[PDB]
Protein backbone atom coordinates (compact mmCIF):
# COMPACT_ATOMS: atom_id res chain seq x y z
CA UNK A 1 0.00 0.00 0.00
CA UNK A 2 0.72 3.83 -0.58
CA UNK A 3 4.60 3.63 1.18
CA UNK A 4 5.84 6.68 2.31
CA UNK A 5 9.49 8.20 2.25
CA UNK A 6 10.00 10.89 4.80
CA UNK A 7 12.90 13.43 4.23
CA UNK A 8 13.77 16.82 5.10
CA UNK A 9 13.77 19.94 2.89
CA UNK A 10 16.06 21.98 4.99
CA UNK A 11 19.30 21.46 6.83
CA UNK A 12 18.01 18.68 9.41
CA UNK A 13 16.61 18.59 12.55
CA UNK A 14 13.33 19.91 10.93
CA UNK A 15 11.75 17.09 12.82
CA UNK A 16 11.76 13.85 11.07
CA UNK A 17 11.57 11.99 13.71
CA UNK A 18 8.23 13.39 15.09
CA UNK A 19 6.36 12.71 11.88
CA UNK A 20 7.62 9.52 11.53
CA UNK A 21 6.48 8.70 15.23
CA UNK A 22 3.00 9.81 14.76
CA UNK A 23 2.47 7.97 11.38
CA UNK A 24 3.90 4.77 13.15
CA UNK A 25 1.32 4.68 15.61
CA UNK A 26 -1.48 6.41 13.68
CA UNK A 27 -0.88 4.30 10.02
CA UNK A 28 0.38 1.43 12.30
CA UNK A 29 3.10 0.49 9.40
CA UNK A 30 4.29 -2.86 9.03
CA UNK A 31 8.11 -2.30 8.49
CA UNK A 32 10.09 1.19 9.42
CA UNK A 33 13.02 1.38 7.52
CA UNK A 34 16.04 4.13 7.89
CA UNK A 35 18.18 5.92 5.67
CA UNK A 36 20.34 8.76 4.90
CA UNK A 37 23.90 8.73 6.33
CA UNK A 38 24.75 7.29 9.37
CA UNK A 39 24.40 8.27 13.19
CA UNK A 40 25.50 11.61 12.83
CA UNK A 41 21.40 12.57 12.98
CA UNK A 42 19.85 12.22 16.60
CA UNK A 43 15.91 12.38 15.40
CA UNK A 44 14.26 13.05 18.66
CA UNK A 45 10.39 12.46 19.58
CA UNK A 46 8.43 13.29 22.85
CA UNK A 47 6.43 10.54 24.20
CA UNK A 48 4.00 11.60 27.31
CA UNK A 49 6.60 13.64 28.89
CA UNK A 50 9.73 11.78 27.93
CA UNK A 51 12.18 12.84 25.57
CA UNK A 52 13.34 10.68 23.10
CA UNK A 53 16.63 10.51 20.47
CA UNK A 54 17.58 8.21 17.93
CA UNK A 55 21.06 7.95 15.42
CA UNK A 56 20.42 4.34 14.20
CA UNK A 57 17.07 2.93 14.87
CA UNK A 58 14.49 4.34 13.01
CA UNK A 59 11.80 7.07 14.78
CA UNK A 60 9.55 3.88 14.63
CA UNK A 61 10.08 2.28 17.47
CA UNK A 62 7.25 2.95 19.94
CA UNK A 63 5.01 0.73 17.10
CA UNK A 64 5.49 -2.76 18.94
CA UNK A 65 4.22 -4.44 16.21
CA UNK A 66 6.47 -3.40 13.21
CA UNK A 67 9.67 -4.39 12.07
CA UNK A 68 12.26 -2.19 12.42
CA UNK A 69 14.73 -2.20 9.25
CA UNK A 70 18.08 -0.63 8.50
CA UNK A 71 19.12 0.38 4.81
CA UNK A 72 22.00 -1.00 3.41
CA UNK A 73 23.40 2.49 1.68
CA UNK A 74 23.24 3.35 5.87
CA UNK A 75 26.45 3.49 7.87
CA UNK A 76 25.93 1.38 11.25
CA UNK A 77 28.19 1.81 14.19
CA UNK A 78 27.92 -1.63 16.49
CA UNK A 79 28.62 1.32 19.61
CA UNK A 80 25.50 3.29 19.09
CA UNK A 81 23.28 0.68 18.06
CA UNK A 82 23.55 -1.77 20.92
CA UNK A 83 23.24 1.15 23.03
CA UNK A 84 19.77 2.29 21.60
CA UNK A 85 18.96 -1.29 21.89
CA UNK A 86 19.12 -1.15 25.58
CA UNK A 87 18.07 2.65 25.63
CA UNK A 88 14.69 0.88 24.04
CA UNK A 89 14.46 -2.26 25.84
CA UNK A 90 11.06 -1.02 26.88
CA UNK A 91 9.90 -1.46 23.97
CA UNK A 92 11.59 -5.25 22.88
CA UNK A 93 13.51 -3.45 19.46
CA UNK A 94 15.85 -6.37 19.94
CA UNK A 95 13.30 -8.47 18.68
CA UNK A 96 12.03 -7.04 15.79
CA UNK A 97 15.11 -4.90 14.63
CA UNK A 98 17.15 -5.74 11.45
CA UNK A 99 20.02 -4.93 9.96
CA UNK A 100 21.19 -5.46 6.06
CA UNK A 101 24.16 -7.68 5.69
CA UNK A 102 25.30 -5.15 3.28
CA UNK A 103 25.45 -2.31 5.59
CA UNK A 104 28.98 -0.50 5.91
CA UNK A 105 30.24 -0.09 9.29
CA UNK A 106 31.95 2.76 11.04
CA UNK A 107 35.49 1.70 12.78
CA UNK A 108 36.78 3.38 16.01
CA UNK A 109 39.91 4.70 13.19
CA UNK A 110 37.16 6.97 11.27
CA UNK A 111 35.53 8.23 14.58
CA UNK A 112 38.95 9.25 15.30
CA UNK A 113 30.58 9.95 14.13
CA UNK A 114 32.83 8.96 11.71
CA UNK A 115 30.02 8.89 8.43
CA UNK A 116 32.53 11.07 6.61
CA UNK A 117 35.66 8.93 7.31
CA UNK A 118 33.55 5.56 6.94
CA UNK A 119 32.14 6.52 2.95
CA UNK A 120 35.36 7.48 2.04
CA UNK A 121 36.48 4.06 2.01
CA UNK A 122 32.67 2.83 1.42
CA UNK A 123 32.85 4.09 -2.24
CA UNK A 124 36.88 2.93 -1.94
CA UNK A 125 35.80 -0.45 -1.19
CA UNK A 126 37.98 -0.91 1.70
CA UNK A 127 35.29 -0.73 4.45
CA UNK A 128 34.03 -4.05 6.14
CA UNK A 129 30.36 -5.03 5.99
CA UNK A 130 27.73 -5.90 8.55
CA UNK A 131 28.05 -9.51 7.85
CA UNK A 132 31.35 -9.45 8.85
CA UNK A 133 31.24 -8.85 12.71
CA UNK A 134 30.53 -11.73 14.66
CA UNK A 135 28.45 -9.10 17.28
CA UNK A 136 26.15 -8.19 13.86
CA UNK A 137 24.10 -11.48 12.58
CA UNK A 138 21.10 -12.25 15.07
CA UNK A 139 20.06 -9.21 13.03
CA UNK A 140 21.34 -9.26 9.84
CA UNK A 141 18.66 -9.88 7.17
CA UNK A 142 18.19 -8.76 3.57
CA UNK A 143 16.11 -5.13 3.99
CA UNK A 144 15.86 -4.62 0.34
CA UNK A 145 13.84 -8.36 0.68
CA UNK A 146 11.46 -7.68 3.29
CA UNK A 147 10.15 -4.28 2.09
CA UNK A 148 9.76 -5.96 -1.67
CA UNK A 149 7.95 -8.56 0.24
CA UNK A 150 5.73 -6.83 1.78
CA UNK A 151 5.44 -4.39 -0.54
CA UNK A 152 3.82 -6.72 -2.69
CA UNK A 153 1.96 -8.42 -0.15
CA UNK A 154 0.15 -4.43 -0.05
CA UNK A 155 1.73 -3.95 3.42
CA UNK A 156 2.73 0.01 4.59
CA UNK A 157 6.25 0.43 4.84
CA UNK A 158 7.48 3.59 6.15
CA UNK A 159 11.13 4.87 5.61
CA UNK A 160 12.69 7.68 6.74
CA UNK A 161 16.01 9.68 5.88
CA UNK A 162 18.42 12.17 7.56
CA UNK A 163 19.72 15.34 7.31
CA UNK A 164 18.02 17.73 4.95
CA UNK A 165 18.17 18.68 1.10
CA UNK A 166 20.50 21.16 2.06
CA UNK A 167 22.49 18.81 3.06
CA UNK A 168 22.49 16.93 -0.23
CA UNK A 169 26.33 16.24 -1.55
CA UNK A 170 24.43 16.94 -5.14
CA UNK A 171 22.57 19.25 -5.00
CA UNK A 172 23.43 20.75 -1.29
CA UNK A 173 25.56 23.95 -0.06
CA UNK A 174 28.77 22.81 -1.30
CA UNK A 175 30.72 22.08 0.47
CA UNK A 176 28.83 22.44 3.29
CA UNK A 177 26.85 18.76 2.88
CA UNK A 178 26.91 15.61 3.80
CA UNK A 179 28.27 12.86 2.42
CA UNK A 180 25.80 11.49 0.28
CA UNK A 181 22.26 12.46 -1.43
CA UNK A 182 19.66 12.92 0.99
CA UNK A 183 16.76 13.17 -1.40
CA UNK A 184 13.87 10.82 -1.37
CA UNK A 185 14.86 9.01 -4.60
CA UNK A 186 18.52 8.46 -2.59
CA UNK A 187 16.45 7.17 0.61
CA UNK A 188 14.63 4.22 -1.66
CA UNK A 189 18.17 3.53 -3.08
CA UNK A 190 19.33 3.19 0.55
CA UNK A 191 16.60 0.80 1.59
CA UNK A 192 16.42 -1.07 -2.17
CA UNK A 193 13.04 0.23 -3.23
CA UNK A 194 12.43 0.78 -7.27
CA UNK A 195 11.02 4.86 -7.71
CA UNK A 196 7.64 3.60 -9.09
CA UNK A 197 7.34 1.62 -5.66
CA UNK A 198 7.18 4.70 -3.87
CA UNK A 199 3.73 6.32 -3.71
CA UNK A 200 3.98 8.78 -1.35
CA UNK A 201 7.49 11.47 -0.46
CA UNK A 202 6.71 13.66 2.33
CA UNK A 203 9.46 16.79 3.27
CA UNK A 204 9.67 17.65 6.19
CA UNK A 205 9.74 21.83 7.58
CA UNK A 206 10.09 23.81 10.37
CA UNK A 207 9.05 26.98 11.28
CA UNK A 208 12.58 27.63 11.38
CA UNK A 209 15.28 26.62 9.68
CA UNK A 210 18.70 25.83 11.68
CA UNK A 211 22.11 25.46 10.67
CA UNK A 212 25.00 23.56 12.22
CA UNK A 213 28.86 24.73 11.65
CA UNK A 214 29.89 26.71 9.22
CA UNK A 215 27.65 26.96 5.52
CA UNK A 216 25.84 30.04 3.88
CA UNK A 217 22.51 30.32 5.52
CA UNK A 218 20.83 33.39 4.04
CA UNK A 219 17.68 33.81 6.02
CA UNK A 220 20.19 33.68 9.43
CA UNK A 221 19.13 35.92 11.69
CA UNK A 222 21.15 37.27 14.64
CA UNK A 223 21.26 34.97 17.28
CA UNK A 224 20.37 37.56 19.75
CA UNK A 225 16.90 37.66 17.97
CA UNK A 226 17.26 33.86 18.33
CA UNK A 227 17.10 34.27 21.97
CA UNK A 228 13.68 36.91 21.98
CA UNK A 229 11.98 34.27 19.76
CA UNK A 230 12.88 31.55 21.94
CA UNK A 231 14.04 29.66 19.46
CA UNK A 232 17.76 28.40 20.89
CA UNK A 233 18.05 24.55 20.26
CA UNK A 234 20.92 22.79 21.42
CA UNK A 235 22.59 19.35 19.43
CA UNK A 236 21.27 16.01 20.80
CA UNK A 237 24.13 14.29 20.63
CA UNK A 238 26.94 17.61 20.09
CA UNK A 239 25.14 20.07 22.34
CA UNK A 240 25.83 22.47 19.85
CA UNK A 241 23.65 25.46 19.51
CA UNK A 242 22.37 25.31 16.01
CA UNK A 243 21.60 28.91 13.76
CA UNK A 244 18.27 30.02 12.97
CA UNK A 245 16.93 31.81 10.43
CA UNK A 246 14.10 32.95 9.06
CA UNK A 247 11.61 30.59 6.88
CA UNK A 248 13.12 30.42 2.97
CA UNK A 249 10.39 30.26 0.54
CA UNK A 250 12.26 29.81 -2.55
CA UNK A 251 14.47 26.70 -0.83
CA UNK A 252 11.29 25.38 0.16
CA UNK A 253 9.41 24.97 -3.27
CA UNK A 254 12.68 23.95 -4.83
CA UNK A 255 13.59 21.27 -1.99
CA UNK A 256 10.41 19.86 -2.58
CA UNK A 257 10.50 19.81 -6.38
CA UNK A 258 13.57 17.23 -6.83
CA UNK A 259 11.93 15.48 -4.06
CA UNK A 260 9.31 14.83 -6.02
CA UNK A 261 7.18 16.08 -2.81
CA UNK A 262 3.39 14.81 -2.75
CA UNK A 263 2.66 16.40 0.61
CA UNK A 264 4.38 18.69 2.81
CA UNK A 265 4.63 18.74 6.43
CA UNK A 266 5.43 21.72 8.90
CA UNK A 267 6.78 21.30 12.38
CA UNK A 268 7.26 23.86 15.58
CA UNK A 269 4.21 26.09 14.45
CA UNK A 270 4.27 27.13 17.85
CA UNK A 271 7.60 28.52 17.86
CA UNK A 272 6.05 30.70 14.79
CA UNK A 273 2.53 31.61 16.65
CA UNK A 274 1.96 30.96 20.51
CA UNK A 275 -1.82 30.94 19.58
CA UNK A 276 -1.80 27.57 17.56
CA UNK A 277 -0.24 25.62 20.55
CA UNK A 278 -1.79 22.24 20.80
CA UNK A 279 -4.22 22.99 18.09
CA UNK A 280 -5.27 19.48 16.29
CA UNK A 281 -7.81 21.26 14.04
CA UNK A 282 -6.88 23.69 11.09
CA UNK A 283 -10.10 25.56 11.50
CA UNK A 284 -9.16 26.35 15.15
CA UNK A 285 -6.06 28.02 14.40
CA UNK A 286 -4.60 31.50 14.81
CA UNK A 287 -5.20 33.69 11.77
CA UNK A 288 -1.06 34.35 11.51
CA UNK A 289 -0.86 30.91 11.74
CA UNK A 290 -3.06 30.06 8.64
CA UNK A 291 -1.26 32.67 7.04
CA UNK A 292 1.92 31.01 7.26
CA UNK A 293 0.84 28.29 6.62
CA UNK A 294 -1.37 29.16 3.23
CA UNK A 295 1.95 30.98 2.02
CA UNK A 296 4.03 27.76 1.99
CA UNK A 297 1.78 26.03 0.11
CA UNK A 298 1.32 28.84 -2.70
CA UNK A 299 5.09 29.31 -2.64
CA UNK A 300 6.26 25.79 -2.49
CA UNK A 301 2.83 24.26 -4.66
CA UNK A 302 2.10 21.53 -2.36
CA UNK A 303 -0.55 21.26 0.42
CA UNK A 304 0.87 20.48 3.73
CA UNK A 305 -0.93 17.00 4.93
CA UNK A 306 0.27 17.42 8.49
CA UNK A 307 1.03 19.98 10.90
CA UNK A 308 2.99 19.87 14.10
CA UNK A 309 1.85 22.35 16.93
CA UNK A 310 3.95 20.83 19.50
CA UNK A 311 6.35 18.38 20.93
CA UNK A 312 3.72 16.02 21.53
CA UNK A 313 2.38 13.31 19.54
CA UNK A 314 -0.95 14.65 20.00
CA UNK A 315 0.01 18.22 19.35
CA UNK A 316 -0.36 17.51 15.45
CA UNK A 317 -3.02 18.39 12.71
CA UNK A 318 -3.70 15.57 10.05
CA UNK A 319 -5.31 17.04 7.11
CA UNK A 320 -4.31 13.68 4.88
CA UNK A 321 -8.31 13.01 4.44
Not at 133 to 144: F, G, I, Q, R
Amino acid sequence: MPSVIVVGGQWGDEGKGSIVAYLSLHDEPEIIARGGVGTNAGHSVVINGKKYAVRQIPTGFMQTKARLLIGAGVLVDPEVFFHELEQLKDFNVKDRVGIDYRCAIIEEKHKQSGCGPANADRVMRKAKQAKDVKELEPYLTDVAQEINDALDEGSLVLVEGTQGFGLSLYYGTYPYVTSKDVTASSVAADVGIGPTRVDEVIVVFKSFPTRVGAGPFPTEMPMEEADRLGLVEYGTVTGRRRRVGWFDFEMARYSARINGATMLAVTMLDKYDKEAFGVTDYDKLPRKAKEFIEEIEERVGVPVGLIKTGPELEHIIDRRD
